[PDB]
Amino acid sequence: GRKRPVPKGATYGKPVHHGVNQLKFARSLQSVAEERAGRHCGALRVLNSYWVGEDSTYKFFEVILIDPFHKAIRRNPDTQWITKPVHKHREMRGLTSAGRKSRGLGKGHKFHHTIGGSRRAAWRRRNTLQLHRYR
Amino acid sequence: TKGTSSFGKRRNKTHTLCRRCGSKAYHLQKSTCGKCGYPAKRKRKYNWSAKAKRRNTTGTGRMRHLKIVYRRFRHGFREGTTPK
Amino acid sequence: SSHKTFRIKRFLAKKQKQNRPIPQWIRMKTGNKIRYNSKRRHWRRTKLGL
Amino acid sequence: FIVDVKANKHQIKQAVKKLYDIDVAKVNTLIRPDGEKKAYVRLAPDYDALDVANKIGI
Amino acid sequence: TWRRWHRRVNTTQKRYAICSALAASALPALVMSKGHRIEEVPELPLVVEDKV
Amino acid sequence: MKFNPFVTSDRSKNRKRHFNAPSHIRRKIMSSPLSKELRQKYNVRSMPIRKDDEVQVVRGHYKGQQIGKVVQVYRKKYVIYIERVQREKANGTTVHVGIHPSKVVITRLKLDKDRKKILERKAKSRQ
Amino acid sequence: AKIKARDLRGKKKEELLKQLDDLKVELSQLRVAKVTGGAASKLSKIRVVRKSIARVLTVINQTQKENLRKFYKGKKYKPLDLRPKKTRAMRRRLNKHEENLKTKKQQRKERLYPLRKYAVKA
Amino acid sequence: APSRNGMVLKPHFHKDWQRRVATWFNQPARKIRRRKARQAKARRIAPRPASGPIRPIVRCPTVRYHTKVRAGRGFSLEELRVAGIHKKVARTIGISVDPRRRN
RNA sequence: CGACUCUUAGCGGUGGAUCACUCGGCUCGUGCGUCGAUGAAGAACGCAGCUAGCUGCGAGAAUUAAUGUGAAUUGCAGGACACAUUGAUCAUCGACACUUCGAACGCACUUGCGGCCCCGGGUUCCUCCCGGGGCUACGCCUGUCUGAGCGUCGCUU
RNA sequence: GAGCCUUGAAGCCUAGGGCGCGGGCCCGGGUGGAGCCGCCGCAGGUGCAGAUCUUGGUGGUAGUAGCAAAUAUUCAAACGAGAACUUUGAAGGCCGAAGUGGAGAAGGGUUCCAUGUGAACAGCAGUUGAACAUGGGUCAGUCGGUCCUGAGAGAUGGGCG
RNA sequence: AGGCUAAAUACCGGCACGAGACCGAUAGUCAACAAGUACCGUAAGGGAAAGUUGAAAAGAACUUUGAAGAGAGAGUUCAA
RNA sequence: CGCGACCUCAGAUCAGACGUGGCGACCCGCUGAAUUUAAGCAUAUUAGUCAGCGGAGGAAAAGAAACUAACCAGGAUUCCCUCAGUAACGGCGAGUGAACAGGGAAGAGCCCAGCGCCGAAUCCCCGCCCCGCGGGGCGCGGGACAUGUGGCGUACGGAAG
Ligand SMILES: [Mg+2]
Ligand SMILES: [Mg+2]
Ligand SMILES: [Mg+2]
Ligand SMILES: [Mg+2]
Ligand SMILES: [Mg+2]
Ligand SMILES: [Mg+2]
Ligand SMILES: [Mg+2]
Ligand SMILES: [Mg+2]
Ligand SMILES: [Mg+2]
Ligand SMILES: [Mg+2]
Ligand SMILES: [Mg+2]
Ligand SMILES: [Mg+2]
Ligand SMILES: [Mg+2]
Ligand SMILES: [Mg+2]
Ligand SMILES: [Mg+2]
Ligand SMILES: [Mg+2]
Ligand SMILES: [Mg+2]
Ligand SMILES: [Mg+2]
Ligand SMILES: [Mg+2]
Ligand SMILES: [Mg+2]
Ligand SMILES: [Mg+2]
Ligand SMILES: [Mg+2]
Ligand SMILES: [Mg+2]
Ligand SMILES: [Mg+2]
Ligand SMILES: [Mg+2]
Ligand SMILES: [Mg+2]
Ligand SMILES: [Mg+2]
Ligand SMILES: [Mg+2]
Ligand SMILES: [Mg+2]
Ligand SMILES: [Mg+2]
Ligand SMILES: [Mg+2]
Ligand SMILES: [Mg+2]
Ligand SMILES: [Mg+2]
Ligand SMILES: [Mg+2]
Ligand SMILES: [Mg+2]
Ligand SMILES: [Mg+2]
Ligand SMILES: [Mg+2]
Ligand SMILES: [Mg+2]
Ligand SMILES: [Mg+2]
Ligand SMILES: [Mg+2]
Ligand SMILES: [Mg+2]
Ligand SMILES: [Mg+2]
Ligand SMILES: [Mg+2]
Ligand SMILES: [Mg+2]
Ligand SMILES: [Mg+2]
Ligand SMILES: [Mg+2]
Ligand SMILES: [Mg+2]
Ligand SMILES: [Mg+2]
Ligand SMILES: [Mg+2]
Ligand SMILES: [Zn+2]
Asked: Which residues 6+ apart lie within 8 Å of H50 measured at CB?
């Protein structure tokens, strides 16, 4: 898990938040690997990634990247969806498999917190104080 | 000897005119800017100061390319020139 | 300071270009209400500071 | 003469020799504080500065 | 901006007001007291032909 | 009544476009009516005025029977100046009086091929 | 005397260069006349001289650009100033052919099962 | 703070609701937009009828609404096979097809 | 009797309140979806005949070319006044041009110091010789060129 | 309201006439020059004597305090309408080489120089100035930066995030 | 435990746009005006004041006192 | 010892191409307090917000069920009215707080890995010819990727011979 970057473990708040040692970071390490790979190479497009190794400390992933300007990918129209500019940097918006699995969406009674789109859109639609002309 | 006798010793300017936004903020002793952050690749902007965005965002200078981007978008980026 | 870099002399050269009053024909123009240069900098009261 | 600031002694010397058809002994440049360059172009002793000034019209 | 601007009326009261206005348009004293010049005008509510 | 929703009835917007219209719009603004015999002869209501048009003034301090030729058209001031219409200063120097071209009845136009094309378009559009 | 663009566009570059050199000689002589005092009828003239220099330079650059395009037209990998300019998103448009390019399964599916036109009242 | 005999009130206004106030000032605007959308569809798309695909007779799952009836989604592939037509051929005819609906 | 002080009224004097006006804001709604490595936003400097600011431009610098309209811009002298040649201003702008810093990109930046290729004159040629033109930032993709291994193997000495 | 009017609306003043108990109002007289009011309903950012109220302006104080740190000025002439102060002659003094002298670094940016004006600035004054307006002025192989490292700051390889 | 997909939805940034039971230069955006300007702080940053002659300058020719500032006559304008 | 093939790699100012940065009102991902309330204050509320960081588009996200329900069963995502200030959470204090129906706008569905079958029938690049305007895209001859697996036939609604 991650350690809180506050100096000397001091939070300066209520006793809710003094747990500097344990913040357990809602994104997965697979999503961290996707972020680091795509941000080191923003010219590529992060498709997916998978686990290949662990010992104690270092967790090892292999990431597949798509080149949106090679001619074999600009042709073959089962692949042209990732060439479109709405798929730029999927790894940092949370559009891959590990990204969706870290966002925690899906159909069910176990996912009413993010009922549609995202949890912030669900918060928006549930705390919109809606007002009309005729009341 | 705290005030007017100590104002006379102020002689060496720490801030000098930077070269990206030009606002006298390039701190020479630290080799960085105080307003835009010149050795950083990105402009130093924040949300706690709305007036800094009001000074520094687009619409306050030339927009010498961006206005003619509007002027070409008004017709649709033509390539042919004219009839006779 | 009597010796300084080239950008400071560019800045001081533009300020010497600025330091001149309104000519007598712009006030004589049509639809004008500019009567004196309000951006007139004097070298004692206002210091430009590089 | 008054010269643009992007020129040097050699370009001023070549410009004078290729425009006014006269030889140049030396060129001393300063930056005039309005923003231009003041160039003192001393000519060869074979030429006459008064005659060159009358031919260029100053 | 969220002042309560627009006010809903019952549709029965809307139709009631329409019927009351159309009934009060038939009496000559009410329309002359509103100020329309009905001196030389013929009979109340005027019905013109289908060629109009 | 105004029906097209892409034109203003706003007083501020109309005065803004009027006092900041460019010169090719100000030529259309500074249009002048014609005399009754000339509009009978040409079948046109009004024409934009130019440098060499003869002018009878109908309203103002100078009124009627003063057919003169204009000299200057300040489109910045919306003012034509007439050669016959004079006013002395204090020091005996004459100067032309400011006359707006909407209070101007043109008695003689200037003949030009471009104005013949304009007049033909006016007559064809008036029909 | 006047300098017309249709007069400039018909001449060769060896005459345009000499006429430009003559315009710049007149430019320098009227700069000398501007510095000295009694040449007050030459300042609108130096205005129209520098506008004429701009016109001649424009005609020369137009001629050079169209002369470059006459043999860079139809060539693969044309240079960057001759490539289209429009905007970056319109550079990252695929193609009309790459947009209309469809896979064989979807093409055969549209061959077999096309959309129908109909009406349902009786 | 409380008073005489009135109902205990707990309004949910402690959160900063003033930023997120969505007031329907564009409700006739959306009405005109959606009128023009339906009219532009009926003009440009087809002589197909508005609300094009046909919907099934469907009973509502409840002990409350199951006495009533509803226009469903699709025609429940076993039903479509008994009617005897292909799936996408039915979709191009105008039959709405849902592969999930059982019988 | 005059001088000083107080209260009204008339007139006069910094003062700009009230009233009247608006090329201004504020709110709402609709239409479109638009930056950049082919150099973005921003900044510095410069440009008018008389030109400090704003506005407009980039050594072609108060705009160039083309189209449309059709005799002006204007405070002043001048300039094209021509239109049975091409035509001033204005708007559109679709063609050219767009100094320097700036993601800024040869290095950090003191406008300093270089390194290749080509062209002109300077002892007609490199040898740290002047001017001009092109290139020279990081990461990465596909393909080409070169070589590193006691990584694995084939054939032979 | 076939309301009021450039034959004078709003606004403002008034030792004028009046009404209502009062909130206030109507008319007359004087400036002003383009909009205003009455009734019935409707909606308010709708009435000020205060809040060490906010902004702006003005009195008593008041022609009052104050123009007093560093020994000191005086006569004649001149340009000038105008001189305790500007310039020159002369006299007497001070700073007295650790200077009230001659030039520099940082800092200022045209203040340096000439000509002209003296409403504005200089706490009085000017014919004077660092004020104003116009025009000038900074020339380098051999003076310094540029070259070098010092304390230190720093990117790539690498690591962290 | 792999992936795409238009529609209804949102928009206080931007390009034009139309309306207002809104405000009227101490109000309304800080800014109707050479406004993020003058100016202040080393810097982050803070941040103003400031609309109106006339229908057209026709902005007072000329005489006179003073060196001028200013003034008395005279004149333009319905009106100084 | 030398030559060659494959696999791991390094170099270049190799040919072609790509990301940086800005605006950020709407949208996505992370993490992220306290003033305030609870009349005190720790749990709670403020708030999964303010600030901070990273991204793209005119929309974004989501989107074809490892779903809802438990009866005469429905059937992608989104948006509105209801559900509902309800079930429920809470020093069960202050307060917080959904969902399934149901009615409407919108309607569009699909593809791939595996399984086998097709002698890789597939894609990238280079050179010349066939070509029309304002310009780049099909067909001929050899250089690579790919058998550690291109493309067609296939998608849980069954599919193939
Ligand atoms: Mg109610
Ligand atoms: Mg002491
Ligand atoms: Mg750098
Ligand atoms: Mg300062
Ligand atoms: Mg308006
Ligand atoms: Mg009580
Ligand atoms: Mg709060
Ligand atoms: Mg005031
Ligand atoms: Mg032209
Ligand atoms: Mg070169
Ligand atoms: Mg009343
Ligand atoms: Mg109030
Ligand atoms: Mg109000
Ligand atoms: Mg008061
Ligand atoms: Mg009171
Ligand atoms: Mg007080
Ligand atoms: Mg006082
Ligand atoms: Mg005294
Ligand atoms: Mg005393
Ligand atoms: Mg003293
Ligand atoms: Mg004397
Ligand atoms: Mg004398
Ligand atoms: Mg002595
Ligand atoms: Mg000593
Ligand atoms: Mg000394
Ligand atoms: Mg001096
Ligand atoms: Mg003098
Ligand atoms: Mg004084
Ligand atoms: Mg001065
Ligand atoms: Mg020497
Ligand atoms: Mg470091
Ligand atoms: Mg690194
Ligand atoms: Mg799935
Ligand atoms: Mg998905
Ligand atoms: Mg959508
Ligand atoms: Mg006022
Ligand atoms: Mg103000
Ligand atoms: Mg006027
Ligand atoms: Mg009067
Ligand atoms: Mg309390
Ligand atoms: Mg407390
Ligand atoms: Mg919480
Ligand atoms: Mg935030
Ligand atoms: Mg970005
Ligand atoms: Mg975009
Ligand atoms: Mg998705
Ligand atoms: Mg409670
Ligand atoms: Mg909560
Ligand atoms: Mg499925
Ligand atoms: Zn900066």
From this structure: H38, H41, H42
The experimental method is cryo-EM
H22 to chain E: closest CA residue: E2
Return the residue of G nearest to B72 by Cα: G86
Asked if residue A83 lies in contact with residue G94, where contact means CB atoms within 8 angstroms, the answer is yes
How close does chain G come to A75, measured CA to CA in Å? Answer: 7
Cα-to-centroid distance, C2 and ligand 25 (Å): 21
β-sheet bridge partners, residue A65: A46
Closest ligand relative to A94 C-alpha: 46
Asked if F101 and F27 count as a contact pair (C-beta separation under 8 A), the reply is no
> In this structure, what DSSP letter does residue A18 have?
-
Q: How far is the CA of C43 from the centre of ligand 4 (A)?
A: 13
Burial of A14 (0-12, 13-18, 19+ CB in 10 A): exposed
G89-98: list long-range contacts, CB under 8 Å, 24+ apart: G89/A85, G90/B77, G92/A85, G94/A74, G94/A80, G94/A83, G98/A74, G98/A75, G98/A80
The position carrying tokens 């950083």 is B40
Hunting for tokens 């690749």 — which residue is that? Answer: B41
Resolution in Å, one decimal place = 3.5
d(CA C13, CA D35): 5
Quick check: A44 and A69 in contact, CB under 8 A?
no
Q: Work out how many CB contacts closer than 8 A connect E with H.
A: 5
User: Where would I find the H helices in chain H?
Assistant: 27-44, 78-83, 87-93
Interface membership of B20 toward C (CB under 8 Å): no
Residues of G in contact with A74 (CB under 8 A): 94, 98
DSSP state of A4: P
Give the residue whose CA sits closest to L80 at C1'.
A130
Tokens, residue G113: 């099962």
Sole residue written with tokens 């009979």: E43
The number of residues making up chain B comes to 84
